[PDB]
TrEMBL record, chain A:
<dbReference type="InterPro" id="IPR000845">
    <property type="entry name" value="Nucleoside_phosphorylase_d"/>
</dbReference>
<feature type="binding site">
    <location>
        <position position="233"/>
    </location>
    <ligand>
        <name>inosine</name>
    </ligand>
</feature>
<feature type="binding site">
    <location>
        <position position="210"/>
    </location>
    <ligand>
        <name>adenosine</name>
    </ligand>
</feature>
<feature type="binding site">
    <location>
        <position position="191"/>
    </location>
    <ligand>
        <name>inosine</name>
    </ligand>
</feature>
<protein>
    <recommendedName>
        <fullName>Purine nucleoside phosphorylase</fullName>
        <ecNumber>2.4.2.1</ecNumber>
    </recommendedName>
</protein>
<feature type="binding site">
    <location>
        <position position="211"/>
    </location>
    <ligand>
        <name>phosphate</name>
    </ligand>
</feature>
<dbReference type="GO" id="GO:0047975">
    <property type="term" value="F:guanosine phosphorylase activity"/>
</dbReference>
<feature type="binding site">
    <location>
        <position position="233"/>
    </location>
    <ligand>
        <name>guanosine</name>
    </ligand>
</feature>
<feature type="binding site">
    <location>
        <position position="192"/>
    </location>
    <ligand>
        <name>a purine D-ribonucleoside</name>
    </ligand>
</feature>
<keyword id="KW-0328">Glycosyltransferase</keyword>
<dbReference type="GO" id="GO:0005737">
    <property type="term" value="C:cytoplasm"/>
</dbReference>
<feature type="binding site">
    <location>
        <position position="210"/>
    </location>
    <ligand>
        <name>inosine</name>
    </ligand>
</feature>
<comment type="pathway">
    <text>Purine metabolism; purine nucleoside salvage.</text>
</comment>
<feature type="binding site">
    <location>
        <position position="234"/>
    </location>
    <ligand>
        <name>adenine</name>
    </ligand>
</feature>
<feature type="binding site">
    <location>
        <position position="107"/>
    </location>
    <ligand>
        <name>phosphate</name>
    </ligand>
</feature>
<dbReference type="InterPro" id="IPR011268">
    <property type="entry name" value="Purine_phosphorylase"/>
</dbReference>
<feature type="binding site">
    <location>
        <position position="234"/>
    </location>
    <ligand>
        <name>inosine</name>
    </ligand>
</feature>
Length: 270, 283, 280
């Protein structure tokens, strides 16, 4: 892995800047239709970016709702074995590219008993189990260029962005699907046992997933404002103690794409 | 360091198959109480890990672990005598490999015992707590044994851990205990893994108890996860080798020797229990 | 460099060639203890840079030998926090070196977030127990081959925070008129270096944790493992925010400042504890 220090991040950023003229203000990490809505877009496969982590995923530049965006199509999940530096690099690259707001979605298990399949849970906070347990993405020498040794995670999930997202949902008639909640990261890749889910629920967790927190931590560390939503893709089984016709349509994607586009449209500009 | 991929697992499996004709249906990982199990194995071949190329090496004080093939209650078994505990510093691949080797050897059921601290206040020293579920603290915390490239040959990227502790096997174990007059010693419970090797502080025990944990140990889950991942059915029991101290203001301290002593004392019972379970496993 | 008997001996032997002081008490300066080293008399200051095979922190930390309240001490000025990326062996080595040097009692301070709602900024929370989240999660400092020379494979953490030393510390606080600042509590280690989210703090609090920090437990574990008695205190350098809706937050400069304000008190406290430690 190449260290996510100022020097390497600059190199990758500079390379990307030679491929696109688009200075992204908003970065989006796709937990997939979004990219499709992007206009006047350049698609840069990771494979074409020297020193960029490989998953091939694409970096997509263009405009969305009249805003310059960089979209990550292909994430680096820790359960895959990616290093802290590999996961951190793209976010820090976004920082150097001009990204001020990071919007991310993920799939999560609904722990909260009031959640419904396909609900949206806006992250208003998280519990970073790996981070509490000495697998925090920031462990290692602090990269001072990007942020402080001991980042505070207060307002990690920008309250204004959260308010905005909620309003946009409300206005476009799907406020009923939208919740705010605490996301706990399970390092994965095992789904959580019922005992784990029960514990996580009782810990005050609403949704559980294997992603996002590390990117959020890096983003916050370098001052990028964060908006994150979990799609409740399954209801966690809490009880350790018959198949039907199932529709698994990418309609949450369309809704979520629309939601993101409409949020981006209303983001304050400069 | 040898990756627990299809290629290496096959190599080890193939080597073992050149040493024994026994195709094991049941794999048994001897924890505590099970030291004796191996002894009951009939028509057995004992294959020290040292004699298996690319097989992980363990030792009990310099004495290499053994893979023991033979029959038990008329069933072909492979018995692991010598486990790889993560607190020893073994890698994910080192711990996973033997289970995947068992898979290739024909193992369909994994039976494992371990020593555990009794968190549940209703547990008694030497009670048997059948795992009906677990809390994989290392797993939640980014030290899951499956972290890394998924080995597709063995199982899926995101294994579900529903019915990880096969409910039918649990039911069977309980019946066998009941029938042989020690149902009173047998509980089902949630096992939480402490990575270890420190025993849990009273504050840790209190927390774990309040998290809904019944017993705590430093083993087993990683093997269970690998087993489940490759579709091996799992039966696991904790011997309550000590009652967890929940109160920091207290003399009573966990110690490995007492732990070994409870295993030693219950080993015969547990051996018998396992043998009688194996006897009634569907074939 | 593995913290085995051989390497620890080498480092210890080197140090013993630099100082005649056989330390009975080792002190790890956290927060409130920058000053401690200053009170040390007849002291030799050995920068880590001058100790072959000794871990390097910073500039450069010092090993300080001398007497404090008439007792021979070794003071660590410069710790190895796991969030910096130090290995188990790097963190364990100095403690094991202390063991070989003659250390019988380890006194350590740290900065911590006050989870317990009854805590005040600048309170002292004596550790009476801990929750070693990294340890529960397979990042225990002892993971790896056990170094038998130093201790057992499965150390018990009963009375990890020596009750007698805790009693003493409380008495000393009481006698010197700051018992009101002194609490005993459960310390939970967050691996860090992020401060805890409000959701994390809430969880930790409900887990029965009183203070949260990113240090100490690994040293305590190594100390206990090799039979060194442990006394540990957290300075409450910030009150944990439990509510995400709250502009209010941890500020590291305020942590440092709060720590520093109490250093004199904490130095005095430690000196007065050391003074009353039973001797041989
Ligand atoms: N983690 C752990 N804790 C306790 Cl109390 C034990 N007693 C026997 N094995 C054990 N493993
Ligand atoms: N992990 C952690 N949390 C809080 Cl509130 C702290 N305050 C001082 N050091 C600290 N370390």
């Amino acid at each position: 892995s190449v260290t996510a220090n100022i020097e390497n991040v600059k190199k990758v950023a500079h390379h990307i800047q030679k491929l696109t003229s688009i200075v992204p203000e908003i970065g989006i990490i796709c937990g997939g239709k979004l990219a499709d809505g992007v206009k006047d877009k350049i698609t840069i496969p990771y494979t074409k970016i020297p020193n960029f982590p490989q998953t091939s995923g694409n970096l997509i530049f263009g405009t969305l709702s009249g805003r310059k965006v960089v979209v990550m199509q292909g994430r680096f999940h820790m359960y895959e074995g990616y290093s802290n530096d590999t996961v951190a690099l793209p976010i820090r690259v976004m920082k150097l590219l001009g990204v001020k707001i990071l919007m991310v979605s993920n799939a999560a298990g609904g722990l909260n008993r009031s959640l419904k399949l396909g609900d949206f849970v806006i992250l208003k906070d998280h519990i970073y189990l790996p981070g509490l347990g000495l697998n925090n993405i920031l462990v290692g020498p602090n990269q001072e260029a990007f942020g402080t040794r001991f980042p505070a995670l207060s307002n990690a999930y920008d309250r204004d962005l959260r308010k905005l997202a909620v309003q946009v949902a409300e206005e476009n008639g799907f406020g009923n699907l939208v919740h705010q909640g605490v996301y706990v990261m399970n390092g994965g890749p095992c789904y959580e046992t019922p005992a784990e889910c029960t514990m996580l629920l009782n810990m005050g967790c609403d949704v559980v997933g294997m992603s996002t927190i590390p990117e959020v931590v890096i983003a916050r560390h370098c001052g990028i404002q964060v908006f994150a939503v979990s799609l409740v893709t399954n209801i966690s089984v809490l009880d350790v103690e018959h198949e039907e016709v199932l529709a698994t349509g990418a309609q949450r994607a369309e809704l979520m794409q629309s939601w993101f586009e409409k949020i981006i449209e209303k983001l304050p500009k400069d």
